[PDB]
Amino acid sequence: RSIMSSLSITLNDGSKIPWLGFGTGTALYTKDAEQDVLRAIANGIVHLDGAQVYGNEDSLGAAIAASGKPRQSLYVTTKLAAVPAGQNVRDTLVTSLKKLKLQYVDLFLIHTPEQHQGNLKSVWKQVEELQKEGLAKSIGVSNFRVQDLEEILDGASVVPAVNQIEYHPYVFKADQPVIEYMKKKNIVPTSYGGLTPIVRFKGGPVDPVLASIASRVGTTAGQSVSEGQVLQLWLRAKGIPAITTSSKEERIKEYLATETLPGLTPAEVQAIDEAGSKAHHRVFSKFWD
């Protein structure tokens, strides 16, 4: 499996980002983070999502090196945290690249606008220069509201390629404005937290809908399909890359299956939209509310 051999989404700069990703997330121990990345790579996930702030870039780089998979087969994202005192954005990326043991990242994101209040335009210009310098192939943002995007786009030479956000049926209704804005600017959303409805809020209104659709998709595919896999197919139907976090090979194998399971129909996506819209559950980036 490689970026080329995998389902991918085309970004506004021409590059392809694999639809299925795996993130080290907020993994507490770097020893676990490394093993989970190795498991993700071994099972065929070719999109790896890291972040400065949680300190797991060393594990991500060690796992890439230990996997035996060519780095050029993989798409690597990392994310700008706060700029340490006496440094600039470039400094953090050079530090990230040394930890990742890479010459460039495929994608460099501003992790959150809350860490750059009053300096958003300055930070984005610096990230634009890092793309010119060859250190980040594509550049984007994370957890940016419409207003935040408006700010950095005012006088920008590069439109962010992605906005990585919490995205699942229980934020669907609240996120409709930013989703519409991004589609007008050709910013691709990428989702984290895609399993939130059933991991954190099992028993809400989306569950019977997911159960019904999983039965349908399963009969079309000739294999058992879980409610979690339908939540990813919902993202796939919208063209939104899914960043996952499960450590377990059995769940990782399920994620992989959703790359090629039969797609959801319009009525099925609509039904999930509607059921999700009966409840708002935002787990991360509460400043959005």
- Is the dihedral angle over the CA atoms 135, 138, 144, 150 positive or is it negative? positive
Whether the CB-CB separation of 27 and 60 falls below 8 Å is answered with no
- Ramachandran area for residue 222 (φ above 0: left; ψ -120 to 50: alpha; else beta): left
Residue 216 amino acid letter: R
Whether the CB-CB separation of 161 and 107 falls below 8 Å is answered with yes
Q: How was this structure determined?
A: X-ray
Residue 118 CB burial class (10 angstroms; 0-12, 13-18, ≥19): exposed
CA 164 to the chain's CA centroid = 5
Locate 77 and state its tokens: 């994202």
Whether the CB-CB separation of 25 and 245 falls below 8 Å is answered with yes
* Block residue for tokens 């990345």: 37
| Beta carbons within 10 angstroms of residue 44's beta carbon | 17
214-247 as b/e, with b when 16 or more CB fall inside 10 Å?
Answer: beebbeeeeeebbbbbbbbbbbbeeebbbbbbbb
- Ramachandran area for residue 2 (φ above 0: left; ψ -120 to 50: alpha; else beta): beta
CATH fold for domain 8-288: TIM Barrel (3.20.20)
Q: How far apart are CA 41 and CA 49, in angstroms?
A: 12
Residue numbers annotated as active site: 54, 111
| Beta carbons within 10 angstroms of residue 114's beta carbon | 11
Q: How far apart are CA 169 and CA 186, in angstroms?
A: 22
Half-sphere exposure of 61 (CA within 13 A, CB side): 18
Residue 75 pairs with which residues in a beta bridge?
47
Whether the CB-CB separation of 282 and 171 falls below 8 Å is answered with yes
Residue 157 CB burial class (10 angstroms; 0-12, 13-18, ≥19): exposed
- CA dist 287 → 51, 98, 227 (Å): 20, 32, 29
Q: Which value in Å is the resolution of this experimental model?
A: 2.0
| Beta carbons within 10 angstroms of residue 85's beta carbon | 5
Whether the CB-CB separation of 202 and 211 falls below 8 Å is answered with no
Q: Name the residue among 34, 50, 54 with its Cα closest to residue 42.
A: 34
Tell how strand 16-18 and strand 8-10 pair up: antiparallel
Residue 189 has φ and ψ, to the nearest 5°, of -75, 145
Q: How far apart are CA 64 and CA 34, in angstroms?
A: 9
SS3 per-residue string spanning the chain? CCCCCCCEEECCCCCEEECEEEECCCCCCHHHHHHHHHHHHHCCCCEEECCCCCCCHHHHHHHHHHHCCCHHHCEEEEEECCCCCCCCHHHHHHHHHHHHCCCCEEEEEECCHHHCCCCHHHHHHHHHHHHHHCCEEEEEEECCCHHHHHHHHCCCCCCCCEEEEECCHHHHHHHHHHHHHHHHHCCEEEEECCCHHHHCCCCCCHHHHHHHHHHHHHHHHCCCCCHHHHHHHHHHHCCCCEEECCCCHHHHHHHHHHCCCCCCCHHHHHHHHHHHHCCCCCCCCHHHC
Q: How far apart are CA 130 and CA 108, in angstroms?
A: 9
Residue 166 pairs with which residues in a beta bridge?
192
